[PDB]
Design a protein around this ligand. Structure first.
Ligand SMILES: CCCCOc1ccc(-c2c(C)ncc(C(=O)O)c2C)cc1CNC(=O)c1ccc(C(F)(F)F)cc1F
Ligand SMILES: CCCCOc1ccc(-c2c(C)ncc(C(=O)O)c2C)cc1CNC(=O)c1ccc(C(F)(F)F)cc1F
Ligand SMILES: CCCCCCCO[C@@H]1O[C@H](CO)[C@@H](O)[C@H](O)[C@H]1O
Ligand SMILES: CCCCCCCO[C@@H]1O[C@H](CO)[C@@H](O)[C@H](O)[C@H]1O
Lengths: 257, 256
């Protein structure tokens, strides 16, 4: 009992230590209590690229696509240090850690993306900018069809009203997953995953005591997250096939191979 | 600062390797004597006072995989202690270790070996080379070539300060297949080799042609592991009864 309480406290500390944007910091900005420069067209995007403190320019949709890859690459840096900060994770052999991150970071990215989003847009560049969803909708396909489902997911996910102490356990349960293809020491990860999910439902009882059925709802979001990454990797197969102009970051080439 | 770079790696070496060449040379010269293992009985005694048992040759082969698995644990933390290495994305770290740990292992074996055998079990035992030769093929064909290299490598008379820079150059190799950030690695390797060459002329001022000799040993090690990888693959096909540690199954999966 007092082990899961200590486990939750340590994972939450890793979370706050390594991630650049909490859901608390983002709700502060999106409610005007922390103003981000609104990016809604080519005009404000060019000003942002000159004014905001953040490859050959091919076009507008491809430029935004490169900005998205930067976010992913940077978040993967943080997601590594978050998982490395978990002793059970660092105990695994280093190649099993890569297997977990390879199949794990994108599920965790789309969950954390809900933490910096309302139904009208998202926060970019350390919270100093707000890119409207309608401007993202107006990009040309496939780049439009890639971004839009992440909003539709982030809206339904934000209905559960999790805070950062909830997400730290939730994201940790995402990475420490025994279902990953090619895992060397499978039952070891399954044991770690069970400890975190137990720690999650225990923390959900204390922090969200009146919320009924919250834990089985979160498990469903973990299933919805596997589908979202499945469909995402399918659209990435299309970008590498039809978009000969767009280059792909080497870290994303390794993930989608 | 190259002077600080070499000193940091030498610190990570002492910080992560229980058995240094300095410690091992004390035990092999006489300044507690190791328990000599030369037959089945002394091996049996050592298992008490120092996987399903198939036979003796496979049992020793199982205890060799234990040393490799443990030495890979130490090498991982040694590489992680090099801050330039930790900045690499985790997948690139694995690639360097995957194709590098065994070149590093076969070089570090020479630190605990004389012409008559090697130290085992944290230095509390000495396994003879004739007892390793007495094992049946292919287990005898896998171990003896390591002795040949280990004795020729000991002729360079390196100490731990040299080996620390030598091991770091093996791990941080730009030629590893599947490397993501190739230029970054090639830069780090170039820094270590500069630090090694600079450290060699200061520590071995009279050693003629020492640095280009060590570069030949690095190529020699790449040949030894390639030959060692093939022998392991034939074992995985011929010997159904002998099981491989999953960490070695991942390493030898693609080595040709
Ligand atoms: C609920 C939120 C949905 C939107 O968020 C999404 C959705 C999908 C992706 C994505 C894409 C498109 N392609 C490949 C991958 C992959 O990693 O496989 C990923 C993860 C990225 C973001 C994150 N976006 C950004 O951070 C961002 C940054 C700057 C700008 C700016 F316009 F100002 F320049 C625009 C931006 F949108
Ligand atoms: C110059 C030194 C040469 C000998 O050292 C060698 C050579 C090859 C290997 C090896 C093998 C056989 N197979 C696969 C791999 C692989 O990793 O691919 C490796 C690296 C291991 C050792 C290290 N030996 C031991 O540590 C050891 C431990 C206990 C016992 C005991 F008998 F007491 F139980 C005997 C031992 F020899
Ligand atoms: C900790 C020591 C590091 C050595 C581990 C050996 C590396 O294994 C490799 O892990 C990769 C995914 O992680 C796989 O894609 C490769 O097929 C496999 O060869
Ligand atoms: C920091 C997160 C790292 C995640 C990057 C994704 C990992 O890439 C994979 O790395 C393996 C060896 O390194 C290769 O065998 C695989 O073919 C490759 O796809």
């Amino acid at each position: 009992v007092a082990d899961l309480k200590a486990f939750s406290k340590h994972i939450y500390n890793a979370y706050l230590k390594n991630f650049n944007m909490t859901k608390k910091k983002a709700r502060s900005i999106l409610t005007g209590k922390a103003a981000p420069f609104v990016i809604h067209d080519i005009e404000t995007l060019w000003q942002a690229e000159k004014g905001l403190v953040w490859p050959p320019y091919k076009e507008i949709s491809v430029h935004v696509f490169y900005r998205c890859q930067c976010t992913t690459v940077e978040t993967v840096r943080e997601l590594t240090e978050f998982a490395k900060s978990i002793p059970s994770f660092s105990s695994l052999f280093l190649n099993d850690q890569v297997t977990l991150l390879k199949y794990g970071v994108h599920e965790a990215i789309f969950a954390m993306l809900a933490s910096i989003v309302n139904k009208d847009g998202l926060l970019v560049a350390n919270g100093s900018g707000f890119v409207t969803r309608e401007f993202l909708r107006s990009l040309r396909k496939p780049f439009s069809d890639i971004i839009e489902p992440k909003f539709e997911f982030a809206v339904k996910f934000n209905a559960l009203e999790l805070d950062d102490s909830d997400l730290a356990l939730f994201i940790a349960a995402i990475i420490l997953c025994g279902d990953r293809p090619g895992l060397m020491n499978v039952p070891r990860v399954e044991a770690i995953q069970d400890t975190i999910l137990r720690a999650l439902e225990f923390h959900l009882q204390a922090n969200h005591p009146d919320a009924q059925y919250l834990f089985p709802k979160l498990l469903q979001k973990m299933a919805d997250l596997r589908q979202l990454v499945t469909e995402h990797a399918q659209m990435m197969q299309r970008i590498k096939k039809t978009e000969t102009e767009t280059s792909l970051h080497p870290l994303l080439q390794e993930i989608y191979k």
